[PDB]
Amino acid sequence: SRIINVRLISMAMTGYFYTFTRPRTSLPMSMLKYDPIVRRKVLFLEQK
């Protein structure tokens, strides 16, 4: 209830995602991750 599991969706619209945890009383996660479909590092944003 204190922590949640969030899905970071690839902004390349390839359908790959990363799953991390973070507290509820925090801001959504945004990271620069590696997309294995296009084989490049793109921007990953939280699903919701």
Partner: protein
């Protein structure tokens, strides 16, 4: 045959199964030319195939395959992925400028 007095179709005196027994029996004795018209005749089965051919859904004459869902949406799928990458540099510039804390545009 449709009875004249009563508007009802009477089944044929010989069912489709019995029609094949006479054709298979009349062909072994060379008397297939005397049997009346029948959809089970060896020449009728072959003439109908050569004339029209395969008419099943998709692979029939004049029919076109529909394609699987993942095949119909293939071009539109690769065009969406291509559109996102082209806009990738402008999206990271706005992200690195605005910052990870002040970012507010998230997928839905």
């Amino acid at each position: 045959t449709k009875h004249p007095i009563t508007g009802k179709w009477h089944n044929p005196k010989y069912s489709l199964r019995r029609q094949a027994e006479l054709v298979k029996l009349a062909q072994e004795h060379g008397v297939e030319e005397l049997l009346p018209f029948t959809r089970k005749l060896n020449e009728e089965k072959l003439r109908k195939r050569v004339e029209l051919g395969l008419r099943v859904k998709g692979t029939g004459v004049g029919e076109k395959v529909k394609g699987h869902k993942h095949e119909r949406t293939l071009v539109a799928k690769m065009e969406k992925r291509r559109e996102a990458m082209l806009a990738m540099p402008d999206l990271i510039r706005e992200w690195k400028k605005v910052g990870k804390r002040n970012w507010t545009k998230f997928p839905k």
